[model samples]
Target: MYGKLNDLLEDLQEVLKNLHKNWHGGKDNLHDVDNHLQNVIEDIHDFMQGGGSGGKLQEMMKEFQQVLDELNNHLQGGKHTVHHIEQNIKEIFHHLEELVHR
Candidate 1:
Protein backbone atom coordinates (compact mmCIF):
# COMPACT_ATOMS: atom_id res chain seq x y z
CA MET A 1 0.00 0.00 0.00
CA TYR A 2 2.74 2.42 0.90
CA GLY A 3 4.61 1.56 -2.24
CA LYS A 4 1.51 2.19 -4.30
CA LEU A 5 0.96 5.56 -2.66
CA ASN A 6 4.55 6.46 -3.38
CA ASP A 7 4.09 5.46 -6.98
CA LEU A 8 0.97 7.56 -7.28
CA LEU A 9 2.74 10.58 -5.82
CA GLU A 10 5.60 10.12 -8.22
CA ASP A 11 3.22 9.87 -11.16
CA LEU A 12 1.33 12.97 -10.12
CA GLN A 13 4.61 14.81 -9.74
CA GLU A 14 5.63 13.78 -13.21
CA VAL A 15 2.39 14.96 -14.78
CA LEU A 16 2.71 18.33 -13.04
CA LYS A 17 6.30 18.53 -14.18
CA ASN A 18 5.33 17.91 -17.76
CA LEU A 19 2.50 20.40 -17.68
CA HIS A 20 4.80 23.02 -16.25
CA LYS A 21 7.19 22.38 -19.10
CA ASN A 22 4.68 22.47 -21.93
CA TRP A 23 3.10 25.66 -20.67
CA HIS A 24 3.25 28.72 -22.94
CA GLY A 25 1.93 31.26 -20.42
CA GLY A 26 -1.50 31.23 -21.97
CA LYS A 27 -4.35 28.86 -22.74
CA ASP A 28 -1.75 26.13 -23.04
CA ASN A 29 -1.13 26.43 -19.32
CA LEU A 30 -4.74 25.46 -18.87
CA HIS A 31 -3.99 22.15 -20.51
CA ASP A 32 -1.21 21.58 -18.02
CA VAL A 33 -3.56 22.47 -15.19
CA ASP A 34 -6.08 20.04 -16.59
CA ASN A 35 -3.48 17.31 -16.74
CA HIS A 36 -2.50 18.12 -13.19
CA LEU A 37 -6.08 17.56 -12.11
CA GLN A 38 -6.10 14.24 -13.91
CA ASN A 39 -3.00 13.23 -12.04
CA VAL A 40 -4.83 14.05 -8.82
CA ILE A 41 -7.60 11.73 -9.85
CA GLU A 42 -5.08 9.00 -10.52
CA ASP A 43 -3.54 9.67 -7.15
CA ILE A 44 -6.93 9.38 -5.51
CA HIS A 45 -7.41 5.99 -7.10
CA ASP A 46 -4.15 4.79 -5.69
CA PHE A 47 -4.97 6.30 -2.33
CA MET A 48 -8.24 4.40 -2.25
CA GLN A 49 -6.49 1.20 -3.13
CA GLY A 50 -4.24 1.81 -0.17
CA GLY A 51 -7.29 2.00 2.14
CA GLY A 52 -7.38 5.75 2.46
CA SER A 53 -10.16 6.89 4.75
CA GLY A 54 -11.96 9.94 6.16
CA GLY A 55 -12.92 11.28 2.73
CA LYS A 56 -9.76 13.33 2.78
CA LEU A 57 -8.57 12.25 -0.60
CA GLN A 58 -11.91 13.07 -2.16
CA GLU A 59 -11.90 16.53 -0.68
CA MET A 60 -8.38 17.10 -1.80
CA MET A 61 -9.25 15.86 -5.25
CA LYS A 62 -12.10 18.33 -5.41
CA GLU A 63 -9.77 21.10 -4.37
CA PHE A 64 -7.38 20.23 -7.14
CA GLN A 65 -10.24 20.16 -9.61
CA GLN A 66 -11.28 23.55 -8.37
CA VAL A 67 -7.79 24.85 -8.97
CA LEU A 68 -7.91 23.69 -12.57
CA ASP A 69 -11.31 25.17 -12.96
CA GLU A 70 -10.02 28.42 -11.56
CA LEU A 71 -7.20 28.37 -14.04
CA ASN A 72 -9.69 27.88 -16.82
CA ASN A 73 -11.72 30.77 -15.47
CA HIS A 74 -8.63 32.94 -15.41
CA LEU A 75 -7.91 32.13 -19.01
CA GLN A 76 -11.43 32.91 -20.03
CA GLY A 77 -11.48 36.13 -17.99
CA GLY A 78 -8.08 37.30 -19.19
CA LYS A 79 -6.52 37.26 -15.77
CA HIS A 80 -3.09 35.87 -14.98
CA THR A 81 -0.25 36.03 -12.51
CA VAL A 82 3.07 36.44 -14.26
CA HIS A 83 5.16 35.97 -11.18
CA HIS A 84 5.82 32.23 -11.18
CA ILE A 85 4.54 31.26 -14.58
CA GLU A 86 7.84 31.40 -16.39
CA GLN A 87 9.80 30.21 -13.42
CA ASN A 88 7.55 27.21 -13.00
CA ILE A 89 7.75 26.41 -16.69
CA LYS A 90 11.50 26.42 -16.66
CA GLU A 91 11.72 24.50 -13.41
CA ILE A 92 9.39 21.79 -14.54
CA PHE A 93 11.09 21.43 -17.88
CA HIS A 94 14.51 21.15 -16.34
CA HIS A 95 13.42 18.76 -13.60
CA LEU A 96 11.42 16.50 -15.87
CA GLU A 97 14.21 16.36 -18.42
CA GLU A 98 16.67 15.40 -15.75
CA LEU A 99 14.37 12.71 -14.45
CA VAL A 100 13.78 11.32 -17.90
CA HIS A 101 17.43 11.30 -18.95
CA ARG A 102 18.64 9.81 -15.70
Candidate 2:
Protein backbone atom coordinates (compact mmCIF):
# COMPACT_ATOMS: atom_id res chain seq x y z
CA MET A 1 0.00 0.00 0.00
CA TYR A 2 2.80 2.37 0.84
CA GLY A 3 4.50 1.65 -2.44
CA LYS A 4 1.31 2.38 -4.31
CA LEU A 5 0.72 5.66 -2.51
CA ASN A 6 4.33 6.65 -3.03
CA ASP A 7 4.01 6.08 -6.74
CA LEU A 8 0.88 8.20 -6.95
CA LEU A 9 2.56 10.91 -4.93
CA GLU A 10 5.49 10.95 -7.34
CA ASP A 11 3.16 11.26 -10.29
CA LEU A 12 1.47 14.37 -8.92
CA GLN A 13 4.84 15.78 -7.91
CA GLU A 14 5.90 15.51 -11.54
CA VAL A 15 2.93 17.60 -12.62
CA LEU A 16 3.93 20.18 -10.03
CA LYS A 17 7.53 20.13 -11.23
CA ASN A 18 6.31 20.90 -14.70
CA LEU A 19 4.18 23.68 -13.30
CA HIS A 20 7.21 25.12 -11.57
CA LYS A 21 9.15 25.07 -14.80
CA ASN A 22 6.47 25.59 -17.40
CA TRP A 23 3.64 27.21 -15.54
CA HIS A 24 3.20 30.77 -16.74
CA GLY A 25 0.50 31.55 -14.23
CA GLY A 26 0.85 33.56 -11.09
CA LYS A 27 3.83 32.73 -8.88
CA ASP A 28 2.27 33.59 -5.55
CA ASN A 29 1.47 29.97 -4.84
CA LEU A 30 4.87 28.74 -5.93
CA HIS A 31 6.50 28.53 -2.52
CA ASP A 32 3.49 27.06 -0.76
CA VAL A 33 2.99 24.70 -3.66
CA ASP A 34 6.41 23.22 -3.23
CA ASN A 35 5.99 23.01 0.49
CA HIS A 36 2.66 21.25 0.19
CA LEU A 37 4.12 18.83 -2.29
CA GLN A 38 6.84 17.95 0.17
CA ASN A 39 4.37 17.75 3.02
CA VAL A 40 2.23 15.35 1.02
CA ILE A 41 5.09 13.03 0.29
CA GLU A 42 6.48 13.20 3.80
CA ASP A 43 3.08 12.57 5.29
CA ILE A 44 2.41 9.67 2.98
CA HIS A 45 5.68 8.21 4.11
CA ASP A 46 5.31 6.37 7.38
CA PHE A 47 7.42 6.03 10.50
CA MET A 48 9.98 3.22 10.95
CA GLN A 49 7.38 0.51 11.30
CA GLY A 50 5.31 1.32 8.17
CA GLY A 51 2.00 3.23 7.73
CA GLY A 52 0.85 6.71 6.93
CA SER A 53 3.33 9.51 7.57
CA GLY A 54 0.75 11.23 9.85
CA GLY A 55 0.10 14.64 8.37
CA LYS A 56 -3.07 15.86 6.63
CA LEU A 57 -2.30 14.42 3.21
CA GLN A 58 -5.65 15.38 1.77
CA GLU A 59 -5.33 18.90 3.03
CA MET A 60 -2.03 19.19 1.25
CA MET A 61 -3.66 18.05 -1.96
CA LYS A 62 -6.35 20.63 -1.47
CA GLU A 63 -3.53 23.11 -1.86
CA PHE A 64 -2.72 21.53 -5.18
CA GLN A 65 -6.33 21.77 -6.19
CA GLN A 66 -6.32 25.43 -5.32
CA VAL A 67 -3.31 25.97 -7.53
CA LEU A 68 -4.88 24.01 -10.28
CA ASP A 69 -7.96 26.14 -9.97
CA GLU A 70 -5.84 29.18 -10.62
CA LEU A 71 -4.54 27.54 -13.75
CA ASN A 72 -7.93 26.93 -15.31
CA ASN A 73 -7.94 30.07 -17.41
CA HIS A 74 -4.64 29.06 -18.97
CA LEU A 75 -5.90 25.71 -20.05
CA GLN A 76 -6.37 25.21 -23.84
CA GLY A 77 -3.83 28.00 -24.32
CA GLY A 78 -1.37 25.39 -25.61
CA LYS A 79 1.61 27.23 -24.19
CA HIS A 80 4.12 25.18 -22.19
CA THR A 81 1.90 22.15 -22.76
CA VAL A 82 -0.33 23.67 -20.18
CA HIS A 83 -3.58 22.11 -21.26
CA HIS A 84 -2.36 18.55 -21.23
CA ILE A 85 -0.57 19.02 -17.96
CA GLU A 86 -3.81 20.26 -16.50
CA GLN A 87 -5.55 17.24 -17.84
CA ASN A 88 -3.00 14.93 -16.30
CA ILE A 89 -3.15 16.65 -12.95
CA LYS A 90 -6.93 16.46 -12.83
CA GLU A 91 -7.04 12.78 -13.77
CA ILE A 92 -4.36 11.74 -11.31
CA PHE A 93 -5.82 13.75 -8.49
CA HIS A 94 -9.26 12.37 -9.14
CA HIS A 95 -7.87 8.86 -8.96
CA LEU A 96 -5.83 9.55 -5.89
CA GLU A 97 -8.79 11.32 -4.35
CA GLU A 98 -10.83 8.14 -4.41
CA LEU A 99 -7.95 5.98 -3.30
CA VAL A 100 -7.50 8.17 -0.29
CA HIS A 101 -10.97 7.21 0.78
CA ARG A 102 -10.73 3.51 -0.09
Candidate 3:
Protein backbone atom coordinates (compact mmCIF):
# COMPACT_ATOMS: atom_id res chain seq x y z
CA MET A 1 0.00 0.00 0.00
CA TYR A 2 2.83 2.33 0.76
CA GLY A 3 4.43 1.52 -2.55
CA LYS A 4 1.17 2.22 -4.33
CA LEU A 5 0.77 5.51 -2.54
CA ASN A 6 4.33 6.43 -3.39
CA ASP A 7 3.72 5.70 -7.06
CA LEU A 8 0.57 7.79 -6.98
CA LEU A 9 2.49 10.65 -5.42
CA GLU A 10 5.15 10.43 -8.09
CA ASP A 11 2.56 10.48 -10.86
CA LEU A 12 0.84 13.42 -9.21
CA GLN A 13 4.16 15.25 -8.98
CA GLU A 14 4.77 14.68 -12.67
CA VAL A 15 1.32 15.98 -13.49
CA LEU A 16 1.86 19.01 -11.33
CA LYS A 17 5.20 19.72 -13.01
CA ASN A 18 3.57 19.46 -16.41
CA LEU A 19 0.74 21.69 -15.35
CA HIS A 20 3.17 24.20 -13.92
CA LYS A 21 5.00 24.30 -17.22
CA ASN A 22 1.76 24.87 -19.09
CA TRP A 23 0.69 27.49 -16.59
CA HIS A 24 3.95 29.33 -17.16
CA GLY A 25 3.09 29.29 -20.86
CA GLY A 26 -0.37 30.66 -20.08
CA LYS A 27 -2.06 27.54 -21.38
CA ASP A 28 -4.15 26.44 -18.41
CA ASN A 29 -6.74 27.52 -15.88
CA LEU A 30 -4.47 28.16 -12.95
CA HIS A 31 -7.15 28.33 -10.30
CA ASP A 32 -8.71 25.06 -11.32
CA VAL A 33 -5.40 23.28 -11.45
CA ASP A 34 -4.47 24.61 -8.06
CA ASN A 35 -7.73 23.43 -6.56
CA HIS A 36 -7.35 20.03 -8.13
CA LEU A 37 -3.84 19.66 -6.79
CA GLN A 38 -4.92 20.67 -3.34
CA ASN A 39 -7.72 18.18 -3.31
CA VAL A 40 -5.48 15.42 -4.56
CA ILE A 41 -2.91 16.17 -1.91
CA GLU A 42 -5.55 16.20 0.78
CA ASP A 43 -6.95 12.91 -0.38
CA ILE A 44 -3.51 11.35 -0.37
CA HIS A 45 -2.91 12.62 3.12
CA ASP A 46 -6.22 11.21 4.25
CA PHE A 47 -5.37 7.87 2.70
CA MET A 48 -2.07 7.80 4.50
CA GLN A 49 -3.68 8.59 7.83
CA GLY A 50 -5.43 5.25 8.26
CA GLY A 51 -8.00 6.11 5.64
CA GLY A 52 -7.28 3.72 2.84
CA SER A 53 -10.28 1.42 3.02
CA GLY A 54 -14.08 1.43 3.28
CA GLY A 55 -15.46 4.87 3.95
CA LYS A 56 -12.11 6.43 3.26
CA LEU A 57 -12.12 5.25 -0.31
CA GLN A 58 -15.60 6.65 -0.65
CA GLU A 59 -14.38 9.97 0.60
CA MET A 60 -11.51 9.87 -1.82
CA MET A 61 -13.99 9.16 -4.57
CA LYS A 62 -15.76 12.32 -3.56
CA GLU A 63 -12.49 14.15 -3.97
CA PHE A 64 -12.10 12.65 -7.41
CA GLN A 65 -15.59 13.84 -8.25
CA GLN A 66 -14.69 17.32 -7.21
CA VAL A 67 -11.63 17.16 -9.39
CA LEU A 68 -13.78 16.21 -12.35
CA ASP A 69 -16.18 18.98 -11.56
CA GLU A 70 -13.43 21.57 -11.38
CA LEU A 71 -11.86 20.27 -14.53
CA ASN A 72 -15.13 20.45 -16.40
CA ASN A 73 -15.84 23.91 -15.06
CA HIS A 74 -12.56 25.34 -16.34
CA LEU A 75 -12.03 23.33 -19.50
CA GLN A 76 -13.29 25.78 -22.01
CA GLY A 77 -10.02 27.19 -23.31
CA GLY A 78 -6.68 25.48 -22.95
CA LYS A 79 -4.17 23.17 -24.61
CA HIS A 80 -6.05 20.19 -23.09
CA THR A 81 -3.33 19.04 -20.71
CA VAL A 82 -5.79 17.81 -18.11
CA HIS A 83 -6.53 14.69 -20.09
CA HIS A 84 -2.95 13.54 -19.81
CA ILE A 85 -2.91 14.24 -16.13
CA GLU A 86 -6.16 12.39 -15.68
CA GLN A 87 -4.64 9.45 -17.52
CA ASN A 88 -1.75 9.41 -15.11
CA ILE A 89 -4.25 9.40 -12.26
CA LYS A 90 -6.01 6.45 -13.83
CA GLU A 91 -2.75 4.55 -13.95
CA ILE A 92 -2.16 5.36 -10.31
CA PHE A 93 -5.58 3.98 -9.39
CA HIS A 94 -4.93 0.86 -11.44
CA HIS A 95 -1.73 0.17 -9.57
CA LEU A 96 -3.41 0.98 -6.29
CA GLU A 97 -6.02 -1.64 -6.96
CA GLU A 98 -3.36 -4.19 -7.77
CA LEU A 99 -1.56 -3.40 -4.55
CA VAL A 100 -4.78 -3.82 -2.60
CA HIS A 101 -5.40 -7.19 -4.19
CA ARG A 102 -1.93 -8.33 -3.30
Candidate 4:
Protein backbone atom coordinates (compact mmCIF):
# COMPACT_ATOMS: atom_id res chain seq x y z
CA MET A 1 0.00 0.00 0.00
CA TYR A 2 2.48 2.64 1.16
CA GLY A 3 5.10 1.03 -1.06
CA LYS A 4 3.21 2.39 -4.02
CA LEU A 5 3.52 5.93 -2.70
CA ASN A 6 7.22 5.45 -2.12
CA ASP A 7 7.61 4.23 -5.68
CA LEU A 8 5.71 7.27 -6.87
CA LEU A 9 8.14 9.53 -5.08
CA GLU A 10 11.05 7.74 -6.71
CA ASP A 11 9.49 8.09 -10.13
CA LEU A 12 8.84 11.78 -9.51
CA GLN A 13 12.47 12.29 -8.64
CA GLU A 14 13.60 10.48 -11.78
CA VAL A 15 11.28 12.55 -13.93
CA LEU A 16 12.45 15.80 -12.33
CA LYS A 17 16.06 14.86 -12.95
CA ASN A 18 15.52 13.97 -16.59
CA LEU A 19 13.44 17.09 -17.12
CA HIS A 20 16.32 19.26 -18.24
CA LYS A 21 18.04 16.62 -20.33
CA ASN A 22 15.00 15.10 -22.02
CA TRP A 23 12.90 18.14 -22.78
CA HIS A 24 15.08 19.26 -25.65
CA GLY A 25 15.29 15.75 -27.02
CA GLY A 26 11.61 15.64 -27.95
CA LYS A 27 11.34 12.67 -25.63
CA ASP A 28 10.02 13.99 -22.33
CA ASN A 29 7.93 16.92 -23.39
CA LEU A 30 5.58 19.22 -21.44
CA HIS A 31 2.65 16.85 -21.89
CA ASP A 32 4.68 14.04 -20.36
CA VAL A 33 5.67 16.20 -17.40
CA ASP A 34 2.10 17.37 -16.91
CA ASN A 35 0.86 13.79 -16.98
CA HIS A 36 3.38 12.76 -14.37
CA LEU A 37 2.25 15.62 -12.17
CA GLN A 38 -1.35 14.68 -12.77
CA ASN A 39 -0.54 11.17 -11.62
CA VAL A 40 0.85 12.57 -8.40
CA ILE A 41 -2.29 14.66 -7.88
CA GLU A 42 -4.54 11.65 -8.46
CA ASP A 43 -2.64 9.63 -5.89
CA ILE A 44 -2.87 12.41 -3.37
CA HIS A 45 -6.57 12.86 -4.05
CA ASP A 46 -7.25 9.17 -3.63
CA PHE A 47 -5.35 9.02 -0.37
CA MET A 48 -7.15 12.07 0.94
CA GLN A 49 -10.57 10.75 0.02
CA GLY A 50 -9.85 7.33 1.43
CA GLY A 51 -8.84 8.66 4.84
CA GLY A 52 -8.73 12.42 5.28
CA SER A 53 -5.22 13.57 4.33
CA GLY A 54 -5.52 16.60 6.61
CA GLY A 55 -5.76 20.31 5.88
CA LYS A 56 -2.07 20.87 5.27
CA LEU A 57 -1.78 18.15 2.67
CA GLN A 58 -4.87 19.43 0.89
CA GLU A 59 -3.45 22.95 0.83
CA MET A 60 -0.19 21.76 -0.61
CA MET A 61 -2.07 19.75 -3.16
CA LYS A 62 -3.74 22.93 -4.33
CA GLU A 63 -0.37 24.63 -4.61
CA PHE A 64 0.91 21.75 -6.71
CA GLN A 65 -2.10 22.12 -8.98
CA GLN A 66 -1.24 25.77 -9.49
CA VAL A 67 2.17 24.72 -10.66
CA LEU A 68 0.54 22.36 -13.12
CA ASP A 69 -1.64 25.20 -14.30
CA GLU A 70 1.41 27.26 -15.01
CA LEU A 71 2.90 24.36 -16.89
CA ASN A 72 -0.19 24.24 -19.05
CA ASN A 73 0.21 27.91 -19.87
CA HIS A 74 3.87 27.52 -20.74
CA LEU A 75 3.15 27.94 -24.40
CA GLN A 76 2.05 31.50 -23.86
CA GLY A 77 5.32 33.32 -23.17
CA GLY A 78 5.43 31.90 -19.72
CA LYS A 79 8.03 33.48 -17.49
CA HIS A 80 10.82 31.30 -16.06
CA THR A 81 8.97 28.19 -17.17
CA VAL A 82 11.14 25.30 -16.14
CA HIS A 83 13.26 27.26 -13.74
CA HIS A 84 10.36 28.37 -11.57
CA ILE A 85 8.53 25.06 -11.90
CA GLU A 86 11.57 23.00 -10.95
CA GLN A 87 12.01 25.01 -7.79
CA ASN A 88 8.32 24.75 -6.93
CA ILE A 89 8.33 20.99 -7.44
CA LYS A 90 11.46 20.63 -5.35
CA GLU A 91 9.81 22.49 -2.47
CA ILE A 92 6.67 20.37 -2.77
CA PHE A 93 8.75 17.22 -2.86
CA HIS A 94 10.33 18.12 0.46
CA HIS A 95 7.01 18.72 2.21
CA LEU A 96 5.46 15.62 0.65
CA GLU A 97 8.33 13.45 1.78
CA GLU A 98 8.07 14.68 5.36
CA LEU A 99 4.27 14.60 5.57
CA VAL A 100 3.61 11.38 3.68
CA HIS A 101 6.36 9.37 5.35
CA ARG A 102 3.77 8.23 7.89
Candidate 5:
Protein backbone atom coordinates (compact mmCIF):
# COMPACT_ATOMS: atom_id res chain seq x y z
CA MET A 1 0.00 0.00 0.00
CA TYR A 2 2.86 2.35 0.72
CA GLY A 3 5.29 1.48 -2.06
CA LYS A 4 3.82 3.65 -4.77
CA LEU A 5 3.18 6.47 -2.33
CA ASN A 6 6.77 6.43 -1.09
CA ASP A 7 8.06 6.90 -4.60
CA LEU A 8 5.56 9.62 -5.33
CA LEU A 9 6.52 11.61 -2.27
CA GLU A 10 10.19 11.43 -3.16
CA ASP A 11 9.36 12.63 -6.65
CA LEU A 12 7.45 15.56 -5.19
CA GLN A 13 10.40 16.44 -2.97
CA GLU A 14 12.68 16.61 -5.97
CA VAL A 15 10.33 18.80 -7.91
CA LEU A 16 10.02 21.25 -5.05
CA LYS A 17 13.77 21.23 -4.63
CA ASN A 18 14.19 22.20 -8.25
CA LEU A 19 11.66 24.94 -7.92
CA HIS A 20 13.41 26.32 -4.89
CA LYS A 21 16.74 26.28 -6.62
CA ASN A 22 15.50 28.11 -9.67
CA TRP A 23 13.43 30.68 -7.86
CA HIS A 24 14.12 34.24 -8.98
CA GLY A 25 12.11 36.11 -6.41
CA GLY A 26 14.96 38.38 -5.42
CA LYS A 27 16.28 36.21 -2.53
CA ASP A 28 13.24 36.42 -0.23
CA ASN A 29 11.45 33.44 -1.73
CA LEU A 30 10.62 30.14 -0.08
CA HIS A 31 13.92 28.38 -0.58
CA ASP A 32 13.53 26.22 2.53
CA VAL A 33 9.89 25.38 2.14
CA ASP A 34 10.99 22.44 0.07
CA ASN A 35 13.01 21.11 2.99
CA HIS A 36 10.04 21.34 5.33
CA LEU A 37 7.86 19.52 2.84
CA GLN A 38 10.42 16.80 2.33
CA ASN A 39 10.52 16.12 6.05
CA VAL A 40 6.75 15.96 6.19
CA ILE A 41 6.70 13.44 3.40
CA GLU A 42 9.23 11.34 5.21
CA ASP A 43 7.24 11.56 8.41
CA ILE A 44 4.10 10.50 6.60
CA HIS A 45 6.02 7.70 5.02
CA ASP A 46 6.99 6.52 8.47
CA PHE A 47 3.42 6.71 9.71
CA MET A 48 2.20 4.66 6.80
CA GLN A 49 4.92 2.06 7.11
CA GLY A 50 4.51 1.70 10.84
CA GLY A 51 0.85 0.79 10.46
CA GLY A 52 -0.15 3.89 12.31
CA SER A 53 -3.57 5.50 12.31
CA GLY A 54 -4.54 8.24 9.86
CA GLY A 55 -4.26 11.06 12.35
CA LYS A 56 -0.95 12.18 10.91
CA LEU A 57 -2.52 12.35 7.51
CA GLN A 58 -4.71 15.27 8.44
CA GLU A 59 -1.67 17.38 9.10
CA MET A 60 -0.14 16.19 5.86
CA MET A 61 -3.32 17.12 4.06
CA LYS A 62 -3.10 20.68 5.28
CA GLU A 63 0.57 20.99 4.41
CA PHE A 64 0.19 19.49 0.97
CA GLN A 65 -2.71 21.78 0.21
CA GLN A 66 -0.68 24.79 1.24
CA VAL A 67 2.16 23.71 -0.98
CA LEU A 68 -0.19 22.96 -3.84
CA ASP A 69 -1.90 26.30 -3.57
CA GLU A 70 1.42 28.11 -3.47
CA LEU A 71 2.61 26.17 -6.45
CA ASN A 72 -0.41 27.41 -8.34
CA ASN A 73 0.30 30.98 -7.34
CA HIS A 74 4.07 30.73 -7.73
CA LEU A 75 4.02 29.15 -11.14
CA GLN A 76 1.44 31.56 -12.42
CA GLY A 77 4.25 34.08 -12.75
CA GLY A 78 6.57 32.04 -14.93
CA LYS A 79 7.65 28.70 -16.36
CA HIS A 80 10.40 26.24 -15.54
CA THR A 81 11.77 22.80 -16.26
CA VAL A 82 9.85 21.48 -13.29
CA HIS A 83 6.56 23.08 -14.24
CA HIS A 84 4.77 19.72 -14.39
CA ILE A 85 5.24 19.39 -10.64
CA GLU A 86 1.86 21.04 -10.22
CA GLN A 87 0.22 18.21 -12.10
CA ASN A 88 2.14 15.64 -10.14
CA ILE A 89 1.01 17.22 -6.87
CA LYS A 90 -2.63 17.17 -8.00
CA GLU A 91 -2.42 13.48 -8.74
CA ILE A 92 -0.80 12.74 -5.38
CA PHE A 93 -3.29 14.95 -3.61
CA HIS A 94 -6.13 12.92 -5.06
CA HIS A 95 -4.48 9.67 -4.16
CA LEU A 96 -3.78 10.90 -0.64
CA GLU A 97 -7.39 11.93 -0.05
CA GLU A 98 -8.46 8.41 -0.93
CA LEU A 99 -5.83 6.79 1.25
CA VAL A 100 -6.58 9.07 4.13
CA HIS A 101 -10.13 7.83 4.34
CA ARG A 102 -9.48 4.25 3.48
Candidate 6:
Protein backbone atom coordinates (compact mmCIF):
# COMPACT_ATOMS: atom_id res chain seq x y z
CA MET A 1 0.00 0.00 0.00
CA TYR A 2 2.75 2.38 0.97
CA GLY A 3 4.70 1.43 -2.12
CA LYS A 4 1.78 2.35 -4.35
CA LEU A 5 1.46 5.75 -2.70
CA ASN A 6 5.21 6.33 -2.90
CA ASP A 7 5.10 5.79 -6.66
CA LEU A 8 2.14 8.12 -7.05
CA LEU A 9 3.99 10.86 -5.23
CA GLU A 10 7.05 10.21 -7.34
CA ASP A 11 4.96 10.62 -10.50
CA LEU A 12 3.68 13.94 -9.20
CA GLN A 13 7.23 14.98 -8.44
CA GLU A 14 8.27 14.07 -11.99
CA VAL A 15 5.65 16.36 -13.50
CA LEU A 16 6.67 19.14 -11.15
CA LYS A 17 10.23 18.69 -12.38
CA ASN A 18 9.07 18.90 -15.97
CA LEU A 19 7.13 22.03 -15.10
CA HIS A 20 10.36 23.61 -13.91
CA LYS A 21 11.96 22.90 -17.28
CA ASN A 22 9.00 23.99 -19.37
CA TRP A 23 8.20 27.02 -17.28
CA HIS A 24 7.45 30.40 -18.82
CA GLY A 25 6.10 30.65 -15.47
CA GLY A 26 3.60 28.92 -17.74
CA LYS A 27 0.05 28.48 -16.60
CA ASP A 28 -0.20 25.57 -18.98
CA ASN A 29 2.60 23.73 -17.26
CA LEU A 30 1.17 24.52 -13.86
CA HIS A 31 -2.19 23.25 -15.04
CA ASP A 32 -0.53 20.05 -16.15
CA VAL A 33 1.09 19.67 -12.72
CA ASP A 34 -2.19 20.43 -11.03
CA ASN A 35 -3.90 17.71 -13.04
CA HIS A 36 -1.11 15.24 -12.33
CA LEU A 37 -1.25 16.09 -8.64
CA GLN A 38 -4.96 15.47 -8.61
CA ASN A 39 -4.20 11.94 -9.71
CA VAL A 40 -1.91 11.50 -6.73
CA ILE A 41 -4.51 12.97 -4.39
CA GLU A 42 -7.14 10.63 -5.75
CA ASP A 43 -4.91 7.66 -5.09
CA ILE A 44 -4.40 8.85 -1.54
CA HIS A 45 -8.13 9.05 -1.05
CA ASP A 46 -8.56 5.60 -2.44
CA PHE A 47 -5.88 4.26 -0.15
CA MET A 48 -7.47 5.90 2.83
CA GLN A 49 -10.81 4.46 1.90
CA GLY A 50 -9.19 1.07 1.84
CA GLY A 51 -8.37 1.40 5.58
CA GLY A 52 -5.19 3.43 5.51
CA SER A 53 -6.69 6.47 7.18
CA GLY A 54 -4.53 6.57 10.23
CA GLY A 55 -3.61 9.79 11.99
CA LYS A 56 -0.22 10.24 10.37
CA LEU A 57 -1.56 9.78 6.87
CA GLN A 58 -4.36 12.16 7.67
CA GLU A 59 -1.75 14.76 8.57
CA MET A 60 0.03 14.10 5.33
CA MET A 61 -3.25 14.56 3.49
CA LYS A 62 -3.55 18.01 5.01
CA GLU A 63 -0.12 18.88 3.69
CA PHE A 64 -1.19 17.76 0.22
CA GLN A 65 -4.15 20.10 0.43
CA GLN A 66 -1.81 22.96 1.31
CA VAL A 67 0.28 22.32 -1.78
CA LEU A 68 -2.83 22.12 -3.93
CA ASP A 69 -4.10 25.36 -2.50
CA GLU A 70 -0.83 27.12 -3.19
CA LEU A 71 -0.73 25.68 -6.69
CA ASN A 72 -4.19 27.03 -7.38
CA ASN A 73 -3.21 30.38 -5.95
CA HIS A 74 -0.26 30.50 -8.33
CA LEU A 75 -2.58 29.49 -11.14
CA GLN A 76 -4.78 32.45 -10.41
CA GLY A 77 -2.00 34.94 -9.77
CA GLY A 78 0.36 33.89 -12.62
CA LYS A 79 3.36 33.99 -10.35
CA HIS A 80 6.64 32.12 -10.41
CA THR A 81 6.58 28.56 -9.19
CA VAL A 82 6.39 28.07 -5.44
CA HIS A 83 9.55 26.45 -4.18
CA HIS A 84 7.99 25.61 -0.82
CA ILE A 85 5.66 23.10 -2.38
CA GLU A 86 8.74 21.16 -3.37
CA GLN A 87 9.80 21.29 0.26
CA ASN A 88 6.42 19.96 1.27
CA ILE A 89 6.83 17.16 -1.24
CA LYS A 90 10.19 16.30 0.25
CA GLU A 91 8.66 16.17 3.72
CA ILE A 92 5.83 13.99 2.47
CA PHE A 93 8.38 11.67 0.93
CA HIS A 94 10.07 11.45 4.30
CA HIS A 95 6.79 10.50 5.93
CA LEU A 96 6.30 7.84 3.30
CA GLU A 97 9.71 6.43 4.14
CA GLU A 98 8.75 6.19 7.78
CA LEU A 99 5.40 4.64 6.97
CA VAL A 100 7.01 2.00 4.75
CA HIS A 101 9.23 0.72 7.50
CA ARG A 102 6.25 -0.30 9.56
Best-performing candidate as measured by TM-score: 5
RMSD of every candidate to native, in Å, equals 11.0, 4.2, 4.2, 10.8, 3.1, 10.2
Residues 13-81, candidate 2: write the lDDT tens digits: 667665654454444555565566556555554421244433344665576565555455444343465
Task: Please give the lDDT score at residue 34 for candidate 3.
Answer: 52
Better of 2 and 3 by lDDT: 2
Compare candidates 1 and 3 on TM-score and give the better one.
3
Ranking by TM-score: 5, 2, 3, 6, 4, 1
Q: Clashing pairs in model 4? A: none
Spell out the clash pairs found in candidate 2.
Answer: none
Per-model TM-score on C-alpha atoms: 0.35, 0.58, 0.55, 0.40, 0.69, 0.42
Pairs of residues at least 3 apart in sequence or in different chains that clash in candidate 5: none
How does each model score on lDDT?
0.43, 0.54, 0.53, 0.50, 0.60, 0.51
lDDT of 3 by residue, 53-83 (tens): 4345444644544553455455445436656
Per-residue lDDT tens digits for candidate 6, residues 13-100, read 5545434433445546556545545655655645544545455455555545454454645543333334444555646655554554
Q: Which lDDT value does model 6 have at 22?
A: 32
Per-residue alpha-carbon lDDT of model 4 for 1-102, expressed as tens digits? Answer: 333554444444444443434334333465565565656565664654445454435564655445444454443443354445555566555656555655
- Which prediction has the highest lDDT against the true structure? 5
Per-residue CA lDDT of candidate 5, range 69-99, in tens? 5455665355563366666665666666566
* Candidate 6 global CA lDDT score: 0.51
State which candidate, 1 or 4, has the greater TM-score.
4
Stretches of candidate 4 exceeding 4 Å from the true structure: 1-28, 49-79
Provide the lDDT at 60 for model 3.
62
